[PDB]
Each structure stands twice: as structure tokens, then as C-alpha cells.
From a paper:
The atomic model shows the typical fold for a pseudouridine synthase from the TruA family.
Furthermore, we observe that the D146A mutation leads to a 10-fold decrease in the affinity of the enzyme for the full-length H7 substrate (Kd of 2.2 µM instead of 0.2 µM seen with the WT enzyme) clearly indicating that removing the catalytic aspartate destabilises the complex formation. Differences between structures of ΔhPus1p and ΔhPus1p D146A are limited to external, poorly conserved loops, which confirm the flexibility of these regions previously identified by Czudnochowski et al.. Similarly, N4 of the MES and N1 of the HEPES molecule are nearly indistinguishable. A HEPES molecule is bound to the active site in the structure of pseudouridine synthase 10, although its orientation was different.
Residue numbers in the entry: 83 to 101, 108 to 348, 352 to 394
Write the structure that this text describes.
Amino acid sequence: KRKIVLLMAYSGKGYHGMQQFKTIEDDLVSALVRSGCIPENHGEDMRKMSFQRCARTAKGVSAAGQVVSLKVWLIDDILEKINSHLPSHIRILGLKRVTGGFNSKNRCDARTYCYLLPTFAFAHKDRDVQDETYRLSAETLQQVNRLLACYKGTHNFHNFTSQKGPQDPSACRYILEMYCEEPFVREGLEFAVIRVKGQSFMMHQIRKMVGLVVAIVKGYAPESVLERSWGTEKVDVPKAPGLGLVLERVHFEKYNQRFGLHEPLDWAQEEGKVAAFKEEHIYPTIIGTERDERSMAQWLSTL
């Protein structure tokens, strides 16, 4: 009855992707059914409400700004309703009324991800402290950033995914920005955040991009391998865990220079919520997982 676009956020842990455990969409559909937004048959076959997501986030991957689009009964106080049938770690942050022909998946352009990791993924395997007390130096952070900056621009990223040959056009991808933020300490443990904006991403690309920069900084490999990895010959690139991977923003920067959308598509009023959900549900869960289960310490021992 009224096609809409939802801005939503979630903690990835305990789910099996967006689309053996339940998925993010299972919780949402359940909430959509219970709120009265959609009929049961529409939940059984999501095509009937024309459901679309922008990012098929993988197992364990979180999101601060996932975007979906669908037809619903536009009930009173719809946001509160849907949210009242959802857990804490899943939130519908915003609603925008949109034209019926709209498809969020196809009409979006760039993507921004985040990677939250303990800082000992950057400790040199010989000259740095080898326990939890390690603290990222300004020199090393600088190395990390210069390395991440080498990714900027266009490249043949075939070595950062799989099942794609070097001559394959779809293997080429475009990175807009990539860097690491200044570290912070939560209860004796230090972490840091990596941000990456790309026009589009392939399977494991970000995880492999981060895995390689980790392998270099730690000193398991020389800087040379970064430029080598773009050559046609195959190079086994280390794939970092997906635990700290966070979909941050789905962009529509090129939407108007291509279309002209019953109301504009920016989430400016929801920004305080966006940050809040990140600080309350996304970040502490990742931190809690590294503290108790040691995802990163385990993956590091495999290099």
C-alpha cells in the first residue's frame, strides 16, 4: 500500500547473515508480521511485498546503516511498532516514504565499512611487546595508514577474492578512502577502527585487504607483496576474521544525478541514534567477543 525505505542497524553475533541460526531478516519479518505491517503470506514469500536489501552481510557481520525497501501497510507509529517486536541488538532507525518503482539494491552506489580489531594485530612479531599490554605507536599507526592508502584508487583486486581470474573485468574494484583511526582502551584492552569506502565490494575483499596489511605490519611479509598482489600471478592473501566487520553506510550520492523519491534520502536526524547504537550494541559486542573468546588472537597464530 505504501513503498518505503528503512534504515536499520544490528549486531551480527548470533545470526547467520542478513538473508544454521536465524538471520537478521527473520527477526524483521517476524516483527513486520506482529506489528501488522505485513500479512503472513508476505512473510512466507518476501517477493509479494517486493523486499530488497542493499547488502547481503555475511555471517557475524554487523551493520550501523543497512538499507532495505518494501511495500507495507503504513500503520500509525510504525517505527515504534516494528521496534517493539525486535530485540535490543536490532533497530529500525529511520523511515523514508518512496515511489513504488523504487529498488534500494539496484539504485544505491558506494558502501562504507568499518573494521574493529584489537591493536595487537599490528604488533611486530619480533621487536614489539607480545601480550595484551602492547600499545600502538604513532610510528606503526603511520605505517598502517600509508599501507592502507596504497589501496586507494582503482586496482585488479582478483587476489583479494576467489573464483575470479586476473583478466576478468569484474575483478577490478574502486576504493575511495581507507584508513585507521587513533586507538582506544576498553578495560585493559586496546582496539582500533579501520574505515573503508568502496564503490562496490567482492567476497572477502575487505577481510583480505585487512589481512594483508596485518601480515605486513606484523612482519610476516615485506611491503613488496602489496604491489605484487596486483600482478596477474596468484598470491595467497591472508583473510582476517569477519567478526569486527561492520556495514556503516549505504550511499546514494549519485542517485539524483541519475534519477531525481517522494522525499529526499539522507538520514541526518537519525545520526545521533546511529552513533548511539554503534556505541551501545555494535562495538561492545565485538569487544566482548575478543575479550572472552579471542577471535583475533586465534587467527593471528595461523599466520
